[PDB]
Every structure is written in C-alpha cells, then in structure tokens.
Design a protein around this nucleic acid. Structure first.
Length: 45
RNA sequence: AGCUUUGCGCAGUGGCAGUAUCGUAGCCAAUGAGGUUUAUCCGAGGCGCGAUUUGCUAAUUGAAAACUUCCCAAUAGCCGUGACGACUAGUCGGCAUUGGCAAUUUUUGACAGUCUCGAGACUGG
C-alpha cells in the first residue's frame, strides 16, 4: 500500500523533468549572392 | 716618432628642427650688406618671392584598400529487439538499429579544509 521492494533507477528511464537538456546554438547567417554570380537571375537555394 | 691646430669629407653617440633649415633663376653686396651700444667705430650676407625626398609598420572607412569563396548529400560501449549462424524452449558469437542508460555493487563523484612526526589525528556546529 506504500507503492515495497526498494528501487534504484539505474538504467531505467526516469519519470519527468529530469531529462531536461537545452542547447543554445546560433549558426552563421547563410546569405545569398547578388553581384557577379555568372548564374541565372533568381537566387540559388 | 709622437703630440697638436685649421679647413673639408665620411661615419657614430647625443641634441635641435616653422623666430628652424634652405632654394632664389629677381635685385643688391667687401668697388661694402647692415648698423639706436663705443660712430674718424663696427664688417656679412641682406630685401622680397617660394618652399619644407625615401623605405617600413599600424589603424580606420569601404563590399572590394589590389602581387597572379559559399552551400548540399554520404563515409571516415552496454541493456532490448531482428535475422543469420553455432551448440544443447535454453545458451553462445558476430552483425544490424526503429527505446533507454545521474538513486546503494561500479561511468555522473564522500569530498573538501586543517594539524603532527613514508604514517596518523581534527572539523564540516
């Protein structure tokens, strides 16, 4: 009724917000080319 | 032979450099420039105009500051699962990837500070 048998969460996935990771990255700005391209007028992807 | 003087040239230490350093082709000047001192004396440039090479390096703006770039795709531990295989439903080896790996036996920290002569003691109020 306690809800027995002492537990040890090793390897087992834990319950909740324990798994919280957060990565702050910001990549370099990929701009497009306009002047002196040799390519056709609309942008490349 | 040594010392030494004067002028010039070279290099070096240092100092100075817009009341400084010069050019002058224009004029004047020791056949005298310029002189308030000392003038029956002194003695050198003066007035104007006109100037203030070269190499190296830094920094800034600028898209670009002058010596022959960006982007996409793919390659470069263990527990389960799927097959393949091997050995007797079970076990083992390698391969593969479609969940997980901070709660006492390990990989998410009983560590940190102190003191004494390789060895121990104290504290975490």
């Amino acid at each position: 009724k306690l809800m027995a048998s002492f537990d040890s969460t090793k390897g087992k996935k834990v319950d909740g917000s324990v798994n919280a990771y957060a990565i702050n990255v910001s990549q370099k700005r990929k701009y497009r080319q306009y002047m002196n391209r040799k390519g056709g007028f609309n942008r490349p992807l």
